[PDB]
Amino acid sequence: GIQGLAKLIADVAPSAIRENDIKSYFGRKVAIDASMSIYQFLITTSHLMGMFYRTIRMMENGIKPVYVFDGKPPQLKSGELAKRSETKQHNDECKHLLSLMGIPYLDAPSEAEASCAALVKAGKVYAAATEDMACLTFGSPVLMRHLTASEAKKLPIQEFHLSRILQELGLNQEQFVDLCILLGSDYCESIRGIGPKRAVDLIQKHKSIEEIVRRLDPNKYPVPENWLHKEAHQLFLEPEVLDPESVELKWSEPNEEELIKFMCGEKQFSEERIRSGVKRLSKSRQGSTQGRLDDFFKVTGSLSSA
Amino acid sequence: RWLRPTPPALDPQTEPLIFQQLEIDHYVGPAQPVSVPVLRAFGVTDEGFSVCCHIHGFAPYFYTPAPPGFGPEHMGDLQRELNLAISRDSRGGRELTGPAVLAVELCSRESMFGYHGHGPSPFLRITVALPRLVAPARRLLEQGIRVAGLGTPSFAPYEANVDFEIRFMVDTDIVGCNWLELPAGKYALRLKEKATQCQLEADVLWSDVVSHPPEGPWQRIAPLRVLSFDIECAGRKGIFPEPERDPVIQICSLGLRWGEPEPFLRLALTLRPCAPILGAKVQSYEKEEDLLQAWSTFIRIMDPDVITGYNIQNFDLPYLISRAQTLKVQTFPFLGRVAGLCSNIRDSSFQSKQTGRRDTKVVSMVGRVQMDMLQVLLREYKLRSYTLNAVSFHFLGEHSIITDLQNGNDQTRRRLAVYCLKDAYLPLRLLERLMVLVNAVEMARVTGVPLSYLLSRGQQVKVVSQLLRQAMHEGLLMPVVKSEGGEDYTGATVIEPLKGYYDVPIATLDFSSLYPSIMMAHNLCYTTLLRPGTAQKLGLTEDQFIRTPTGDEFVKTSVRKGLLPQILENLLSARKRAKAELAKETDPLRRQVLDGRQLALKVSANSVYGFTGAQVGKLPCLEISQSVTGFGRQMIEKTKQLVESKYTVENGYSTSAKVVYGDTDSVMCRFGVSSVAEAMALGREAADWVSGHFPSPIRLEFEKVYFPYLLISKKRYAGLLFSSRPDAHDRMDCKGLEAVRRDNCPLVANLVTASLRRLLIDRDPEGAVAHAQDVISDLLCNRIDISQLVITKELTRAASDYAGKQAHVELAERMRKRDPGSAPSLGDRVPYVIISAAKGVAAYMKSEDPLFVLEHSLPIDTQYYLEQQLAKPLLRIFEPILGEGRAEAVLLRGDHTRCKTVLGLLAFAKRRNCCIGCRTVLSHQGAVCEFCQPRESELYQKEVSHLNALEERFSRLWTQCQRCQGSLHEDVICTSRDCPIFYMRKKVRKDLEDQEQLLRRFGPPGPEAW
Amino acid sequence: EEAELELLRQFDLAWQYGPCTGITRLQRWCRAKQMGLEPPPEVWQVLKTHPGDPRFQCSLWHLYPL
DNA sequence: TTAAGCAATTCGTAATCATGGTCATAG
DNA sequence: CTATGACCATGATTACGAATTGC
Ligand SMILES: Cc1cn([C@H]2C[C@H](O)[C@@H](COP(=O)(O)OP(=O)(O)OP(=O)(O)O)O2)c(=O)[nH]c1=O
Ligand code: SF4
Ligand SMILES: [Zn+2]
């Protein structure tokens, strides 16, 4: 994702970040990045064990998950780097443990994270859950971090509100995009010049890198080699994502046998547990609850003390 | 002052050099022979000349596997790995490495971790020019580009990235404080025009040296030169000294050659004219610039090997350096051996779970070695106060006044100089008496690390060093595994007690060197750990591998020998030799310092095992740790089953024994007989019997017989110690109890020791009750010294003490009005006492400095000390001998004695007089009441035997200060807060002041103007 | 003043008049005069042109819990 | 770039929960 | 002028962190 972003925010607009408890998310439908998720568990039954437990915990608290997979990757920086020099096995093994638990899944046209955002900004889901701030760049209004952490690591989930970020940094999404790029995008090389906090300011009185470059120009702050500061700025805007409305996710009922006969058996693992597990998942069948006033009254604005 | 002897007639084409090294050094150098890093080695001859040695031609390297492609087996791609990529996009990959002679080498070696086979594999050896280029190369070969003609596709990991001087010493087999020899015709003295200041300066190539292993005649120590010094400064009132306002007024120095029982140099440099002292030289200057210059010239000319002192690092040297910077003296900070180098102050921190965390400054001296004795005490010893007075009493037996002893006359300055010289002499006596330096030299010879690493580092560099030195002899390379982070594993078992008081003898049987012998006798190592698959599909289980209780499989010794068995066997023989030497001493303090030496070698052997389980470290293998503690648990439950099962009533013996306790290495079995001879005989039979069920060196041994015994909880017991029978008894044992911890008052620890003395030696509970009653009564009647009331606690890292409010943290962070420049820092101990107030929610609001409650006279909370400090340890100890009528017996022995208590607006007194007989306030000054007037001769008789006993206590104390001071004709000035003498000599003046005025109520016994 | 406060501080540390940190200043001046060691007639002539001030008529360390 | 391990007991502070003495007002 | 429970105030129980010692 984007480099030093979380810190930048934390350090200049903490009002857009909250440290809530996993419980407060009861009734929320969230878009997850299966790829990264599946990875997190590894770093070989883990790609599914965590894909198991965690999703149970996410269910137990009322959170309704929708795992997402990536399709045909695009032009990522280090991505096509070895190309300057010239599997899905344990991946789909998950796209199974899911529907066998009654948990949705979607094949993103490319980068899931972008798709996740795609959803979130369509009311189809609450927030996007990844570890990479990218989602924010892609225009996602709400991003939840740590929702896939171990039951142990007592880390609370970290929420981020794009519309609050944009608020403080006084800059449109696009204007925010350039910031992420100059902050350290994983799509193109940043500019050795500007610093985390520095990069902000420039963007603040130069609503684009295109204007930031022509300004500072000495050989004291040179602009990258093959700088695609453009191509990127585009992706973060109009990515490749499956239409939101295209489908309706529906959490089904877990199939104890069919699944336990494809887990503790075919993949060998303590039966007693994966049984009480499927049991618990079956219990926590729901989440949505208590409405907000927003849900019925338009927000007037803000009264500020004299 | 005195110079070294003159090097006469050394001719290099016929004569060799034989000298003993102290310090090594790295140096990046010009003047190459026609590599750039050249090595320095400083040392002394077998006579006393100083030798610098310049060593040439050595360069760092490491290893990396050759990847299986067409590249690194083809010489074109080897030299192309040496060759740089000339493209524009390789500026991140051939600049910071660039044109360096990394080179290409092919060698056949193996990796350490695991057991794959007896067969090696090709590795690449990569040299580098400079030691400060292995870090960017590591940042450019792993995450940098390795697209170079498709020879080495990313990634191949780096193996054996170690330190430069350690790699040199592992290469040539040179250890700390070693004998080094330059043969004839190999070295050139006048090839090096003199850039350092030593006498002999050689200039040798790195393959010419000969290292002598210290053993036989090569086990000596050369005559080194040791200096100690101390300084004085003149401050303001209240204000702690500051290097920009307070001059340095006296420097005092002591110097000796090592091996001679007295010093040879004794110098004192003052800043006003002074008076002569017999045994020392005295020079005087009218300005401080001359004083600092004179000290720098003396320290160049005497040229010492070692510099010691007490708190010289964190106070003395940076004060001198800052004071020389302020007064514009350019030539001061050149104290080292290299002629063109100035010194600088630099911060450093150390932290571990074994010693805690400490933050120190360091000052640079090349060639010379520093030994602050404060840091040696703080690292090895666990004491109550770490002041020079407290450790000098514990081991031997002993600011604003100084500013007017210096602004006065010259006999006052002579008194100041004698005081400063005694201060500068005490750490030498401590260094030679405690066997510090001999043990440091033996530690550096057994481990193979230099002499500066035993004051800066921990226990990892030594086990890394020994493992590398054992790894070069079979051809293995070490890997780099790093993980954050694994989980914990299960530690040691404790057996459930049968709590109480025993009066029939219990015999203790334990295993000696338990974990190193587990690691030895079941062939456990990194290099023989069998992975779960590589046994398959071979089926040979019997006598080729074994299985552990955690679950691993480990190869038998008929295939491999591990590396950790051999390192452990060397350390075990060194400790056995130290104990064999300790078995022939008669002096007690010498016996305990040889016990300290053997304790240090046992700690080293156990830290070898603790290296394996440290998941934050350099090479962890938690499988091994789990196998160790599983074997421990299995063997101790085997011991308990066997001991309780064999000696029984049906098996011809007297009584079936029953184990009362066991804690992971020991077993305390209760046999039944009450004769110590028969218990000793059966216990020795049991130890020697049970030991024959194991491999070797596993052995159980008899150790003691306790008679009687007192078991309170887990890790809390006490008893009386028998070594032989006609050696009747040795001492008590107090494991864990309130007499060995330092979190309490001296009053409580003394009461616990005296109660166990009266209760275990004389077996009289009535004297014990009367003793505890007198202690509580004298507490409530306000006749207990405030030495017995001082509590000390350690001020650790500041965030854990941010997390929850404590008493000592509150006292420390609250500064004083007098001095915001002397206050507790991180790592030290804060002393305090608890005063009485009405804020019962917080015991952190009632704490005060002992000197502040001394000078400002605040009262003491006797109820806090009665119910919170004293009462509950006593209810631990006194209950198990009796019932709960014993709680009522001591709370009733309190109750007969609790009814006897002694007692802005305080200035507006009325001072009502009172009758001495029946306490009735009344008008007039006469002592007796009108109803109690007849019984007046008896009431005068009473209380003059109290004045008589206060008079006898005044005189024994105020003349003891005269003998501790030295003089009988001049004033005492000693406000030593660690002496009971101080502030016990202050209260008897007031007791006598009060008791003398109570007897003047009665008239005078005669006239006085006749 | 400020020159009279160093004369008394110099009289208080001269060893040929006695070991005096328990008593007053004028008592030590008269003790030396009785034995007639050599008291000088200037440490008297500032203890007469003052009243009972505790920074003239007291020894140097009359604080200081020794 | 730098650091040997685990088991167990004790004490203090803030927070959680139980219970009585006043009191305030409806009968 | 007199019952009733709501309200303030003070004491008993639990939880967890810090310190220190035994293997
Ligand atoms: C003291 C100590 C013990 N232990 C472990 C290892 C030991 O094998 C086990 C026994 O503790 P100890 O009895 O204290 O030490 P020891 O048995 O090895 O040597 P000796 O009998 O001669 O005194 O406890 C450690 O791991 N680290 C330590 O610091
Ligand atoms: S008070 Fe007296 S006995 Fe105590 S240390 Fe000082 S001089 Fe010695
Ligand atoms: Zn009377």
Side-chain angles (χ1 to χ4, degrees), chain B residues 459-460 488 491 843-844 876:
Chain B
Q459 325 275 317
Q460 273 176 2
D488 201 1
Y844 55 87
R876 266 71 169 271

PDB file of all heavy atoms in Angstrom, chain B residues 459-460 488 491 843-844 876, chain D residues 4 6-7 10-11 13-14:
ATOM      1  N   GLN B 459      26.123 -11.961  27.841  1.00  0.00           N
ATOM      2  CA  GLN B 459      26.559 -13.338  27.755  1.00  0.00           C
ATOM      3  C   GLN B 459      26.344 -13.956  26.381  1.00  0.00           C
ATOM      4  O   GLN B 459      26.376 -15.186  26.269  1.00  0.00           O
ATOM      5  CB  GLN B 459      25.826 -14.169  28.805  1.00  0.00           C
ATOM      6  CG  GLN B 459      25.555 -13.443  30.112  1.00  0.00           C
ATOM      7  CD  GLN B 459      26.716 -13.505  31.093  1.00  0.00           C
ATOM      8  OE1 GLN B 459      27.330 -14.551  31.278  1.00  0.00           O
ATOM      9  NE2 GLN B 459      27.011 -12.383  31.729  1.00  0.00           N
ATOM     10  N   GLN B 460      26.114 -13.151  25.338  1.00  0.00           N
ATOM     11  CA  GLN B 460      25.904 -13.705  24.000  1.00  0.00           C
ATOM     12  C   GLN B 460      27.187 -13.742  23.185  1.00  0.00           C
ATOM     13  O   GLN B 460      27.433 -14.718  22.470  1.00  0.00           O
ATOM     14  CB  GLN B 460      24.844 -12.917  23.237  1.00  0.00           C
ATOM     15  CG  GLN B 460      23.422 -13.369  23.478  1.00  0.00           C
ATOM     16  CD  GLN B 460      22.418 -12.488  22.773  1.00  0.00           C
ATOM     17  OE1 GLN B 460      22.790 -11.556  22.065  1.00  0.00           O
ATOM     18  NE2 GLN B 460      21.141 -12.762  22.980  1.00  0.00           N
ATOM     19  N   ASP B 488       5.960 -19.054  24.305  1.00  0.00           N
ATOM     20  CA  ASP B 488       6.649 -19.645  25.434  1.00  0.00           C
ATOM     21  C   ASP B 488       6.465 -21.159  25.413  1.00  0.00           C
ATOM     22  O   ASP B 488       5.643 -21.703  24.674  1.00  0.00           O
ATOM     23  CB  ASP B 488       6.130 -19.049  26.745  1.00  0.00           C
ATOM     24  CG  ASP B 488       7.102 -19.224  27.892  1.00  0.00           C
ATOM     25  OD1 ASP B 488       8.184 -19.796  27.654  1.00  0.00           O
ATOM     26  OD2 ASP B 488       6.785 -18.804  29.023  1.00  0.00           O
ATOM     27  N   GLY B 491       8.078 -24.572  31.619  1.00  0.00           N
ATOM     28  CA  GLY B 491       9.274 -24.676  32.429  1.00  0.00           C
ATOM     29  C   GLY B 491       9.291 -25.843  33.392  1.00  0.00           C
ATOM     30  O   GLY B 491       8.910 -26.959  33.035  1.00  0.00           O
ATOM     31  N   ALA B 843      -0.586   5.519  50.483  1.00  0.00           N
ATOM     32  CA  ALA B 843       0.705   5.422  51.146  1.00  0.00           C
ATOM     33  C   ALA B 843       1.825   6.035  50.323  1.00  0.00           C
ATOM     34  O   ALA B 843       2.966   6.064  50.783  1.00  0.00           O
ATOM     35  CB  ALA B 843       1.037   3.964  51.466  1.00  0.00           C
ATOM     36  N   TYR B 844       1.525   6.512  49.117  1.00  0.00           N
ATOM     37  CA  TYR B 844       2.466   7.263  48.303  1.00  0.00           C
ATOM     38  C   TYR B 844       2.381   8.760  48.552  1.00  0.00           C
ATOM     39  O   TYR B 844       3.065   9.528  47.871  1.00  0.00           O
ATOM     40  CB  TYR B 844       2.249   6.969  46.811  1.00  0.00           C
ATOM     41  CG  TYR B 844       0.839   7.195  46.295  1.00  0.00           C
ATOM     42  CD1 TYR B 844       0.427   8.444  45.845  1.00  0.00           C
ATOM     43  CD2 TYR B 844      -0.072   6.148  46.237  1.00  0.00           C
ATOM     44  CE1 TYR B 844      -0.853   8.647  45.381  1.00  0.00           C
ATOM     45  CE2 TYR B 844      -1.353   6.341  45.765  1.00  0.00           C
ATOM     46  CZ  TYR B 844      -1.739   7.589  45.343  1.00  0.00           C
ATOM     47  OH  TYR B 844      -3.017   7.778  44.878  1.00  0.00           O
ATOM     48  N   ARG B 876       2.911 -15.413  59.536  1.00  0.00           N
ATOM     49  CA  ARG B 876       3.435 -16.546  58.766  1.00  0.00           C
ATOM     50  C   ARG B 876       4.231 -17.495  59.646  1.00  0.00           C
ATOM     51  O   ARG B 876       4.002 -18.708  59.624  1.00  0.00           O
ATOM     52  CB  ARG B 876       4.335 -16.099  57.613  1.00  0.00           C
ATOM     53  CG  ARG B 876       3.729 -15.923  56.243  1.00  0.00           C
ATOM     54  CD  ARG B 876       2.862 -14.755  56.223  1.00  0.00           C
ATOM     55  NE  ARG B 876       2.446 -14.368  54.900  1.00  0.00           N
ATOM     56  CZ  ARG B 876       3.139 -13.524  54.158  1.00  0.00           C
ATOM     57  NH1 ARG B 876       4.266 -13.002  54.621  1.00  0.00           N
ATOM     58  NH2 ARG B 876       2.695 -13.205  52.966  1.00  0.00           N
TER      59      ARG B 876
ATOM     60  P    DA D   4      22.664 -11.004  26.899  1.00  0.00           P
ATOM     61  OP1  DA D   4      23.154 -11.166  28.271  1.00  0.00           O
ATOM     62  OP2  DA D   4      23.603 -10.991  25.763  1.00  0.00           O
ATOM     63  O5'  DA D   4      21.551 -12.118  26.640  1.00  0.00           O
ATOM     64  C5'  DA D   4      20.675 -12.528  27.682  1.00  0.00           C
ATOM     65  C4'  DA D   4      20.282 -13.976  27.492  1.00  0.00           C
ATOM     66  O4'  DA D   4      21.319 -14.807  28.025  1.00  0.00           O
ATOM     67  C3'  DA D   4      19.027 -14.429  28.214  1.00  0.00           C
ATOM     68  O3'  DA D   4      17.880 -14.170  27.418  1.00  0.00           O
ATOM     69  C2'  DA D   4      19.278 -15.920  28.324  1.00  0.00           C
ATOM     70  C1'  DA D   4      20.757 -15.952  28.622  1.00  0.00           C
ATOM     71  N9   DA D   4      21.059 -15.931  30.045  1.00  0.00           N
ATOM     72  C8   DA D   4      21.624 -14.915  30.755  1.00  0.00           C
ATOM     73  N7   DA D   4      21.774 -15.183  32.022  1.00  0.00           N
ATOM     74  C5   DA D   4      21.264 -16.462  32.150  1.00  0.00           C
ATOM     75  C6   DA D   4      21.129 -17.324  33.247  1.00  0.00           C
ATOM     76  N6   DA D   4      21.515 -17.007  34.478  1.00  0.00           N
ATOM     77  N1   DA D   4      20.583 -18.529  33.031  1.00  0.00           N
ATOM     78  C2   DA D   4      20.200 -18.849  31.800  1.00  0.00           C
ATOM     79  N3   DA D   4      20.280 -18.127  30.693  1.00  0.00           N
ATOM     80  C4   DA D   4      20.822 -16.934  30.942  1.00  0.00           C
ATOM     81  P    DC D   6      11.163 -17.496  29.020  1.00  0.00           P
ATOM     82  OP1  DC D   6      10.269 -17.680  27.872  1.00  0.00           O
ATOM     83  OP2  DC D   6      11.329 -16.146  29.595  1.00  0.00           O
ATOM     84  O5'  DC D   6      10.747 -18.488  30.208  1.00  0.00           O
ATOM     85  C5'  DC D   6      10.545 -19.879  29.969  1.00  0.00           C
ATOM     86  C4'  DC D   6      10.356 -20.646  31.281  1.00  0.00           C
ATOM     87  O4'  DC D   6      11.440 -20.317  32.205  1.00  0.00           O
ATOM     88  C3'  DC D   6       9.055 -20.349  32.043  1.00  0.00           C
ATOM     89  O3'  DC D   6       8.510 -21.551  32.592  1.00  0.00           O
ATOM     90  C2'  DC D   6       9.519 -19.414  33.140  1.00  0.00           C
ATOM     91  C1'  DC D   6      10.894 -19.983  33.455  1.00  0.00           C
ATOM     92  N1   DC D   6      11.758 -18.989  34.115  1.00  0.00           N
ATOM     93  C2   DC D   6      12.198 -19.200  35.424  1.00  0.00           C
ATOM     94  O2   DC D   6      11.894 -20.253  36.007  1.00  0.00           O
ATOM     95  N3   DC D   6      12.955 -18.248  36.014  1.00  0.00           N
ATOM     96  C4   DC D   6      13.254 -17.137  35.353  1.00  0.00           C
ATOM     97  N4   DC D   6      14.001 -16.219  35.966  1.00  0.00           N
ATOM     98  C5   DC D   6      12.802 -16.911  34.032  1.00  0.00           C
ATOM     99  C6   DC D   6      12.057 -17.843  33.466  1.00  0.00           C
ATOM    100  P    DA D   7       7.028 -21.573  33.221  1.00  0.00           P
ATOM    101  OP1  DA D   7       6.415 -22.880  32.929  1.00  0.00           O
ATOM    102  OP2  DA D   7       6.340 -20.342  32.806  1.00  0.00           O
ATOM    103  O5'  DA D   7       7.262 -21.516  34.801  1.00  0.00           O
ATOM    104  C5'  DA D   7       7.664 -22.700  35.509  1.00  0.00           C
ATOM    105  C4'  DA D   7       7.683 -22.484  37.020  1.00  0.00           C
ATOM    106  O4'  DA D   7       8.649 -21.465  37.360  1.00  0.00           O
ATOM    107  C3'  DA D   7       6.360 -22.047  37.643  1.00  0.00           C
ATOM    108  O3'  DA D   7       6.140 -22.753  38.858  1.00  0.00           O
ATOM    109  C2'  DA D   7       6.566 -20.563  37.898  1.00  0.00           C
ATOM    110  C1'  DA D   7       8.053 -20.490  38.173  1.00  0.00           C
ATOM    111  N9   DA D   7       8.631 -19.202  37.825  1.00  0.00           N
ATOM    112  C8   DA D   7       8.561 -18.577  36.618  1.00  0.00           C
ATOM    113  N7   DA D   7       9.175 -17.426  36.583  1.00  0.00           N
ATOM    114  C5   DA D   7       9.691 -17.290  37.854  1.00  0.00           C
ATOM    115  C6   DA D   7      10.457 -16.280  38.463  1.00  0.00           C
ATOM    116  N6   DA D   7      10.851 -15.176  37.831  1.00  0.00           N
ATOM    117  N1   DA D   7      10.804 -16.454  39.752  1.00  0.00           N
ATOM    118  C2   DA D   7      10.410 -17.566  40.381  1.00  0.00           C
ATOM    119  N3   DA D   7       9.692 -18.580  39.913  1.00  0.00           N
ATOM    120  C4   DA D   7       9.360 -18.376  38.634  1.00  0.00           C
ATOM    121  P    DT D  10       2.865 -15.697  50.049  1.00  0.00           P
ATOM    122  OP1  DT D  10       3.163 -16.219  51.391  1.00  0.00           O
ATOM    123  OP2  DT D  10       1.546 -15.945  49.442  1.00  0.00           O
ATOM    124  O5'  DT D  10       3.115 -14.120  50.056  1.00  0.00           O
ATOM    125  C5'  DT D  10       4.425 -13.618  50.208  1.00  0.00           C
ATOM    126  C4'  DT D  10       4.496 -12.155  49.818  1.00  0.00           C
ATOM    127  O4'  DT D  10       4.424 -12.051  48.390  1.00  0.00           O
ATOM    128  C3'  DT D  10       3.365 -11.270  50.355  1.00  0.00           C
ATOM    129  O3'  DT D  10       3.870 -10.312  51.267  1.00  0.00           O
ATOM    130  C2'  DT D  10       2.773 -10.600  49.115  1.00  0.00           C
ATOM    131  C1'  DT D  10       3.829 -10.835  48.062  1.00  0.00           C
ATOM    132  N1   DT D  10       3.295 -10.958  46.700  1.00  0.00           N
ATOM    133  C2   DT D  10       3.614 -10.007  45.773  1.00  0.00           C
ATOM    134  O2   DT D  10       4.307  -9.044  46.027  1.00  0.00           O
ATOM    135  N3   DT D  10       3.084 -10.219  44.536  1.00  0.00           N
ATOM    136  C4   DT D  10       2.292 -11.275  44.141  1.00  0.00           C
ATOM    137  O4   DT D  10       1.860 -11.381  43.003  1.00  0.00           O
ATOM    138  C5   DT D  10       2.002 -12.245  45.165  1.00  0.00           C
ATOM    139  C7   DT D  10       1.146 -13.435  44.859  1.00  0.00           C
ATOM    140  C6   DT D  10       2.515 -12.042  46.380  1.00  0.00           C
ATOM    141  P    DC D  11       2.868  -9.537  52.255  1.00  0.00           P
ATOM    142  OP1  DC D  11       3.598  -9.260  53.504  1.00  0.00           O
ATOM    143  OP2  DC D  11       1.607 -10.298  52.300  1.00  0.00           O
ATOM    144  O5'  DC D  11       2.574  -8.149  51.518  1.00  0.00           O
ATOM    145  C5'  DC D  11       3.639  -7.262  51.229  1.00  0.00           C
ATOM    146  C4'  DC D  11       3.203  -6.166  50.276  1.00  0.00           C
ATOM    147  O4'  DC D  11       2.878  -6.716  48.980  1.00  0.00           O
ATOM    148  C3'  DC D  11       1.979  -5.359  50.712  1.00  0.00           C
ATOM    149  O3'  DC D  11       2.292  -4.002  50.618  1.00  0.00           O
ATOM    150  C2'  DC D  11       0.902  -5.762  49.698  1.00  0.00           C
ATOM    151  C1'  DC D  11       1.742  -6.060  48.476  1.00  0.00           C
ATOM    152  N1   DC D  11       1.100  -6.969  47.481  1.00  0.00           N
ATOM    153  C2   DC D  11       1.060  -6.609  46.135  1.00  0.00           C
ATOM    154  O2   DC D  11       1.526  -5.524  45.791  1.00  0.00           O
ATOM    155  N3   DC D  11       0.498  -7.457  45.252  1.00  0.00           N
ATOM    156  C4   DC D  11       0.004  -8.617  45.665  1.00  0.00           C
ATOM    157  N4   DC D  11      -0.547  -9.421  44.759  1.00  0.00           N
ATOM    158  C5   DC D  11       0.048  -9.005  47.025  1.00  0.00           C
ATOM    159  C6   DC D  11       0.594  -8.154  47.889  1.00  0.00           C
ATOM    160  P    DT D  13      -0.983   2.549  48.205  1.00  0.00           P
ATOM    161  OP1  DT D  13      -0.047   3.684  48.262  1.00  0.00           O
ATOM    162  OP2  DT D  13      -1.790   2.190  49.387  1.00  0.00           O
ATOM    163  O5'  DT D  13      -1.947   2.794  46.956  1.00  0.00           O
ATOM    164  C5'  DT D  13      -1.403   2.780  45.643  1.00  0.00           C
ATOM    165  C4'  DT D  13      -2.483   2.606  44.593  1.00  0.00           C
ATOM    166  O4'  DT D  13      -2.801   1.212  44.462  1.00  0.00           O
ATOM    167  C3'  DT D  13      -3.797   3.328  44.879  1.00  0.00           C
ATOM    168  O3'  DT D  13      -4.140   4.140  43.760  1.00  0.00           O
ATOM    169  C2'  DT D  13      -4.797   2.189  45.097  1.00  0.00           C
ATOM    170  C1'  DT D  13      -4.180   1.054  44.317  1.00  0.00           C
ATOM    171  N1   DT D  13      -4.516  -0.266  44.841  1.00  0.00           N
ATOM    172  C2   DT D  13      -4.752  -1.289  43.973  1.00  0.00           C
ATOM    173  O2   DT D  13      -4.723  -1.152  42.767  1.00  0.00           O
ATOM    174  N3   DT D  13      -5.049  -2.485  44.563  1.00  0.00           N
ATOM    175  C4   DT D  13      -5.112  -2.746  45.911  1.00  0.00           C
ATOM    176  O4   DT D  13      -5.382  -3.853  46.351  1.00  0.00           O
ATOM    177  C5   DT D  13      -4.840  -1.620  46.765  1.00  0.00           C
ATOM    178  C7   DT D  13      -4.879  -1.771  48.249  1.00  0.00           C
ATOM    179  C6   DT D  13      -4.554  -0.453  46.193  1.00  0.00           C
ATOM    180  P    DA D  14      -5.278   5.268  43.867  1.00  0.00           P
ATOM    181  OP1  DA D  14      -4.714   6.539  43.364  1.00  0.00           O
ATOM    182  OP2  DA D  14      -5.860   5.248  45.221  1.00  0.00           O
ATOM    183  O5'  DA D  14      -6.380   4.760  42.832  1.00  0.00           O
ATOM    184  C5'  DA D  14      -5.979   4.330  41.539  1.00  0.00           C
ATOM    185  C4'  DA D  14      -7.011   3.404  40.933  1.00  0.00           C
ATOM    186  O4'  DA D  14      -7.003   2.134  41.634  1.00  0.00           O
ATOM    187  C3'  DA D  14      -8.440   3.922  40.982  1.00  0.00           C
ATOM    188  O3'  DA D  14      -8.987   3.907  39.665  1.00  0.00           O
ATOM    189  C2'  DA D  14      -9.158   2.950  41.930  1.00  0.00           C
ATOM    190  C1'  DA D  14      -8.318   1.690  41.831  1.00  0.00           C
ATOM    191  N9   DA D  14      -8.345   0.896  43.050  1.00  0.00           N
ATOM    192  C8   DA D  14      -8.127   1.347  44.312  1.00  0.00           C
ATOM    193  N7   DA D  14      -8.202   0.419  45.226  1.00  0.00           N
ATOM    194  C5   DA D  14      -8.492  -0.723  44.515  1.00  0.00           C
ATOM    195  C6   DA D  14      -8.700  -2.049  44.912  1.00  0.00           C
ATOM    196  N6   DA D  14      -8.641  -2.438  46.179  1.00  0.00           N
ATOM    197  N1   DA D  14      -8.980  -2.956  43.961  1.00  0.00           N
ATOM    198  C2   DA D  14      -9.045  -2.548  42.693  1.00  0.00           C
ATOM    199  N3   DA D  14      -8.851  -1.328  42.195  1.00  0.00           N
ATOM    200  C4   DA D  14      -8.585  -0.452  43.171  1.00  0.00           C
TER     201       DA D  14
END
